[PDB]
Ligand binder design. Structure first.
Ligand SMILES: *[C@@H]1O[C@H](CO)[C@@H](O[C@@H]2O[C@H](CO)[C@@H](O[C@@H]3O[C@H](CO[C@H]4O[C@H](CO)[C@@H](O)[C@H](O[C@H]5O[C@H](CO)[C@@H](O)[C@H](O)[C@@H]5O[C@H]5O[C@H](CO)[C@@H](O)[C@H](O)[C@@H]5O)[C@@H]4O)[C@@H](O)[C@H](O[C@H]4O[C@H](CO)[C@@H](O)[C@H](O)[C@@H]4O[C@H]4O[C@H](CO)[C@@H](O)[C@H](O)[C@@H]4O)[C@@H]3O)[C@H](O)[C@H]2NC(C)=O)[C@H](O)[C@H]1NC(C)=O
Ligand code: XHC
Ligand code: CA
Ligand code: CL
Ligand code: K
Ligand code: NA
Ligand code: ZN
Length: 806
C-alpha cells in the first residue's frame, strides 16, 4: 500500500528513493505504481512541446510549459535544448567543426568531468555505417571521438544480462542475471521481463557502477527510467541535474533508449521501418549535445554511446520444435527462443533423465538448427555455467532460428521479424562503442573489445577503484588520453626446479617399452647443451609462463621444445615450441609406434606409467609436443618421454592428432612461423578457474594421473607476417583455443568423416582468449616481450572469432 496522497512539489526526479509508504517522485516511481498523486502534473509537463520557436523567445515564464524560452531559463537550467539556437543565433552542436578537447573545459566548481552513458537497445554494429546518412550527431561523436568497429556483447545476447554486465564488469554467471527470464531453485522463485519479481534485489549480484560511485563519495544519477517517461524528458532531467549546486550534483548519469530494439523486433534489423527510429535516436543525441553546449559542458563531459546487443532476422517459420524430437515433451520445461534451457517439469520425478534427453536431441535431422549441450560442455569462451539459475541442459540455437517446445507455443503466443540472444561471436549480435570527451582520444579507432571491459574504464573516468570484476584492467588504456591506472604483472608464486640427470633407467618400473636401445664428442656435446637450454630462446619466445599459485614443478629443456612439468599433476602445465615456415612434418616411425621413455631427470614416483593406460580400457594417451614435428630423427626420441605424455580419450586423439599433424604446419606456413604453447586444463566444477588437486573427479584407472577436462593451445606469431615468428620486432598476433576433452565426438555431427571435414570447425567453435586460459591454469603468459604491458593485456583479451568482415 502507498499513501500516494503526499506531493511531488519541489521534488521532481529526486535522487534519493523515499521509504514507503511515503509516495515517490523518482524516475522509477511509475514502475512501482507508487508516484504521488501530482507526479504527472508537476514532473511530466508537456505543454508547448520540446523546442523553442521564434515567437517564444524571451517569453514570460509559464511554469506549465515542458521547457522554457524565457530569459531566465539558463540560470534556472530548464531551457528547451534548442533555446540558444533559436533565440540567440547559436549553432547546433552538430554543425560546429570538431576541435580536439585536450583538457577538460568545465565551469568553476566541477571537481571532475561528469560521465554520461547513453545506452541504446538493439543497436547493431553495422548501423554505424549503414545508417550513417540519417545519424549526423552520432556520426560526429563517432568520427571526432574514440570508436571501435564493434563491441562484443556477453552471452546470452539479451537486454538485461548485457546492461547489467555493462554496469558491473561481470559475466552473467557471476552477476546472476543469466537471461531475460530465470528460475532460481534456492529462492524457489522466478524472474521475468513483465512483473514485479525483477524488482527484488536478490536477483542482482555484483556491484554496479552507481553503487561503486556512491560508496566512494561520487554521486550518481539514477540509471533506470520508467518506460512511459518520454526521451525528451529524460534528457531534460539529466540537464537539470547538471545545474544543481556542486554538493548535490551527480558525477555519473545514464540515459537509456528502448529503440532501435523495439522496432527491430517488429521489422527486422534492416526493415524500411528502421530508418525513423535511427533518425529519432540521433535527434535525442542532438538534444543532449545542444543542451550540454548551452550549459558550457560540451567540452567538459565524457559521453559514452554504447549498445547492449545487435539484432538478427528471425521469423516464425524458422522454429525447431522439441516435440519433433522428444516423446516426453510434457515432462520438460523449456526456456525458449534464441537459446534453449531445459529442466524437469517436476523435481518429484526420478524418471527424468538428462542423458536421454540429450541423446534424443543430438544430430537427429540433417539440417538441425540447434545443438544440445550439458552446460559444462558449452565453449568456455561463453562463461555460461557457474550459476544455479542456468539449467544443466542448454541449446545453442543457430543464428536466424528459434527453438520452442511445441507448435501451440508459437501460434498461440506472424508477429516478429527480428530477435537476438544468439552466441556472442555472431556478427549480427555485435553492437557499438563510441567515447567522446576530454578523457577519450581524438579521432581514434581502437580494435573491437568485449563489453565486460567497460566497467573498469568508467571507474577510471570517475577516479573510482573498481570492485573485483571480469575485465582486465589496463587492456583498454589505449582508449584514453590520460589513464590513472597503470597495471603491473602479477608476481610469480612458485619458482621452478631445473633437474639434471638423477635416475638410472632401471629405477623405473612403469611398464613402458621403447625400441631406443638402438643407440663421439660432436653429437654428445650437442645433446647436453640442448638438455641445458641451448635452444631455449628459439622455443620460449616470450619468457616462461609464471606460475601464480603454490606448487611443485620442473623446467625440462629439449632440442625442439621446453616444458614446465608438474610433480603434483604428473604432466606438463605448459609445453612451448616454435615451428618455422620451413619446418618439415614427418611421421612416427613404425619401430616407435608404442614407445614411451622414462625421463632420467624426474623420479619414478613423479612419473606417469604405461600400465595404468593399458589397464584403463577407456583412456589412451597423446603427447603435448607432437612427434610429427621433431627437427630430426634423433630429436624425435625426446617427444616420447613419459614427461611429454597426457591422458586422452581415443575420440579426442582424432582431434588432437589432426591439429598436431596438419593444422600446426598450415598455421606456420600461413603466419610465417608460429610459437605454440599447449597444455591441460582441469575445471571439474565449471567455474572458469584452475582446479586444486582435491577437486579432480577422474583419474586414469588405478593411478593418480588426473584426467584433464580440456586441452588448450596458444598460437603466437608476428602481426607483420613479413617477419618470422622467431624474429619479430613489433606487435604480436595470437589465436588460442580450449578444446573440451570428451570421450565421444557427439558434438560434431560430421565426425564419422575425415578429420579435414570437421576438426577445424570444432576448434573454431572453442576459440578462446589467452586470458580465459590464464584463469583456467593459474599461469601468466608473455612475461618477456619488447611490448608495453598494456598492449600485452590487449593481446591477452583478443578473441579470434572466424566470422567474416562485418
Ligand atoms: C569473474 O569475476 C568475479 C568477481 O571477481 C569472480 O567471482 C568471484 O569468485 C571468487 C572465487 O570463486 C568468489 O569468492 C568466494 O566468495 C564467497 C563469499 O561470497 C559472497 O560475498 C561476495 C563479496 O561481497 C559476493 O560478491 C558474493 O556474491 C555471490 O553470491 C551472491 C549470493 O549468493 C550472489 O548474489 C552473487 O551474484 C554471487 O554469485 C556468484 O558467485 C557464487 C560463489 O560465490 C556462485 O555460487 C554463483 O554461481 C555466482 O556465480 C557472495 O555473496 C566466500 O565465502 C568463498 O570462500 C570459500 O572458499 C575459499 C577459497 O579460498 C575458502 O578460503 C573459504 O574458507 C570458503 O570455503 C568455505 O565455503 C565453501 C563453499 O561454501 C565450503 O566448501 C568450505 O568447506 C568452507 O566452508 C569465496 O572466497 C567471489 O565471491 C566471486 N564474486 C562474484 C561477484 O561472483 C569470478 O571468479 C570471475 N570469473 C572468471 C572466469 O574469472
Ligand atoms: C529492476 C528494474 C527496474 C526497472 C526497469 C526498466 C523500467 N526496464 C528496463 O528494461 N530498463 C532499462 C534497464 C535495464 C537493465 C539495467 Cl541494468 C538498466 C540500468 C543500466 C542502464 C544503462 C547501462 Cl550502460 C547499464 C545499466 C536499465 C528499466 O530501467 C528494469 C529493471
Ligand atoms: Ca574450477
Ligand atoms: Cl533468456
Ligand atoms: K587404454
Ligand atoms: Na559425431
Ligand atoms: Zn530485444
Amino acid at each position: 500500500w502507498t499513501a500516494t496522497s503526499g506531493s511531488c512539489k519541489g521534488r521532481c526526479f529526486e535522487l534519493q528513493e523515499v521509504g514507503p509508504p511515503d509516495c515517490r517522485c523518482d524516475n522509477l516511481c511509475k514502475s512501482y505504481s507508487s508516484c504521488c498523486h501530482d507526479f504527472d502534473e508537476l514532473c511530466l509537463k508537456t505543454a508547448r512541446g520540446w523546442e523553442c520557436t521564434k515567437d517564444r523567445c524571451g517569453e514570460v515564464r509559464n511554469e506549465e510549459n515542458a521547457c522554457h524560452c524565457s530569459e531566465d531559463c539558463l540560470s534556472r537550467g530548464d531551457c528547451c535544448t534548442n533555446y540558444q539556437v533559436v533565440c540567440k543565433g547559436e549553432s547546433h552542436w552538430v554543425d560546429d567543426d570538431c576541435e580536439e578537447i585536450k583538457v577538460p573545459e568545465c565551469p568553476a566548481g566541477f571537481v571532475r568531468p561528469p560521465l554520461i552513458i547513453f545506452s541504446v537497445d538493439g543497436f547493431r554494429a553495422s548501423y554505424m555505417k549503414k545508417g550513417s546518412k540519417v545519424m549526423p550527431n552520432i556520426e560526429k561523436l563517432r568520427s571526432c571521438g574514440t570508436h571501435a568497429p564493434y563491441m562484443r556483447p556477453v552471452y546470452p545476447t539479451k537486454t538485461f544480462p548485457n546492461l547489467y554486465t555493462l554496469a558491473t564488469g561481470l559475466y552473467p554467471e557471476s552477476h546472476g542475471i543469466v537471461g531475460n527470464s530465470m528460475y532460481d531453485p534456492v529462492f524457489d522463485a522466478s524472474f521475468h521481463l513483465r512483473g514485479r519479481e525483477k524488482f527484488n534485489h536478490r536477483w542482482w549480484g555484483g556491484q554496479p557502477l552507481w553503487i561503486t560511485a556512491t560508496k566512494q563519495g561520487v554521486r550518481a544519477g539514477t540509471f533506470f527510467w520508467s518506460v512511459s517517461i518520454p526521451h525528451e524528458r529524460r534528457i531534460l532531467t539529466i540537464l537539470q541535474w547538471l545545474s544543481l549546486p556542486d554538493n548535490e550534483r551527480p558525477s555519473v548519469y545514464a540515459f537509456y533508449s528502448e529503440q532501435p530494439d523495439f522496432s527491430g523486433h517488429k521489422y527486422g534489423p534492416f526493415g524500411p521501418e528502421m530508418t525513423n527510429p535511427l533518425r529519432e535516436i540521433d535527434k535525442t543525441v542532438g538534444q543532449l549535445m545542444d543542451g550540454l553546449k548551452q550549459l558550457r559542458l560540451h567540452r567538459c563531459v565524457n559521453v559514452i554511446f554504447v549498445g547492449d546487443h545487435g539484432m538478427e532476422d528471425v521469423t516464425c517459420d524458422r522454429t525447431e520444435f522439441l516435440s519433433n524430437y522428444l516423446t516426453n515433451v510434457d515432462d520438460i520445461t523449456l526456456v525458449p527462443g534464441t537459446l534453449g534451457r531445459i529442466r524437469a517439469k517436476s523435481i518429484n520425478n526420478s524418471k527424468y533423465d538428462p542423458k536421454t534427453i540429450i541423446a534424443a536431441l543430438t544430430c537427429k535431422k540433417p539440417d538441425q538448427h540447434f545443438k544440445p549441450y550439458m552446460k559444462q560442455h558449452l565453449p568456455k569462451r561463453l562463461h555460461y555455467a557457474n550459476n544455479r539459475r542456468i539449467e544443466d541442459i542448454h541449446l545453442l540455437v543457430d543464428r536466424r532460428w528459434h527453438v520452442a517446445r511445441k507448435p501451440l507455443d508459437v501460434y498461440k503466443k506472424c508477429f516478429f521479424q527480428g530477435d537476438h540472444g544468439f552466441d556472442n561471436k555472431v556478427n549480427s549480435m555485435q553492437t557499438v562503442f563510441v567515447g567522446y570527451g576530454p578523457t577519450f582520444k581524438y579521432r581514434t579507432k581502437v580494435p573491437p573489445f568485449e563489453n565486460i571491459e567497460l566497467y573498469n574504464v568508467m571507474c577510471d573516468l570517475l577516479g573510482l577503484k573498481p570492485a573485483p570484476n571480469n575485465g582486465t584492467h589496463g587492456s583498454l588504456n589505449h582508449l584514453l588520453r590520460t589513464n590513472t591506472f597503470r597495471p603491473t604483472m602479477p608476481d610469480e608464486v612458485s619458482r621452478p626446479n631445473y633437474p639434471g640427470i638423477m635416475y638410472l633407467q632401471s629405477e623405473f618400473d612403469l611398464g613402458c617399452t621403447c625400441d631406443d636401445k638402438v643407440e663421439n664428442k660432436l653429437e654428445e656435446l650437442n645433446k647436453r647443451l640442448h638438455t641445458k637450454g641451448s635452444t631455449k630462446e628459439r622455443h620460449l619466445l616470450y619468457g616462461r609462463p609464471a606460475v601464480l599459485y603454490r606448487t611443485s614443478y620442473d623446467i625440462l629443456y629439449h632440442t625442439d621444445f621446453e616444458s614446465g612439468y608438474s610433480e603434483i599433476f604428473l604432466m606438463p602445465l605448459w609445453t612451448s615450441y616454435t615451428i618455422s615456415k620451413q619446418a618439415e612434418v614427418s611421421s612416427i616411425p613404425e619401430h616407435l609406434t608404442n614407445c614411451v621413455r622414462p625421463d632420467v631427470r624426474v623420479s619414478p614416483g613423479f612419473s606417469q606409467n604405461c600400465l595404468a593406460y593399458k589397464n584403463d580400457k577407456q583412456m589412451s594417451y597423446g603427447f603435448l609436443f607432437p612427434p610429427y614435428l621433431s627437427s630430426s630423427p634423433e630429436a624425435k626420441y625426446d617427444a616420447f618421454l613419459v614427461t611429454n605424455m597426457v591422458p586422452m580419450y581415443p575420440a579426442f586423439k582424432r582431434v588432437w592428432a589432426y591439429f598436431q599433424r596438419v593444422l600446426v604446419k598450415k598455421y606456420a606456413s600461413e603466419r610465417n612461423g608460429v610459437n605454440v604453447i599447449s597444455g591441460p586444463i582441469f575445471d571439474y566444477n565449471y567455474d572458469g578457474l584452475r582446479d586444486t588437486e582435491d577437486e579432480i573427479k577422474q583419474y586414469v584407472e588405478g593411478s593418480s594421473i588426473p584426467v584433464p577436462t580440456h586441452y588448450y593451445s596458444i598460437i603466437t606469431s608476428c602481426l607483420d607476417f613479413t617477419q618470422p615468428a622467431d624474429k619479430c620486432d613489433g606487435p604480436l598476433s595470437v589465436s588460442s583455443f580450449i578444446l573440451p576433452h570428451r570421450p565421444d565426438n557427439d558434438e560434431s555431427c560430421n565426425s564419422s568423416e575425415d578429420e579435414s571435414k570437421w576438426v577445424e570447425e570444432l576448434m573454431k567453435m572453442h576459440t578462446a582468449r589467452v586470458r580465459d586460459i590464464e584463469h583456467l591454469t593459474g599461469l601468466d603468459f608473455y612475461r618477456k616481450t619488447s611490448r608495453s604491458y598494456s598492449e600485452i593485456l590487449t593481446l591477452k583479451t583478443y578473441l579470434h572469432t572466424y566470422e567474416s568482415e562485418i
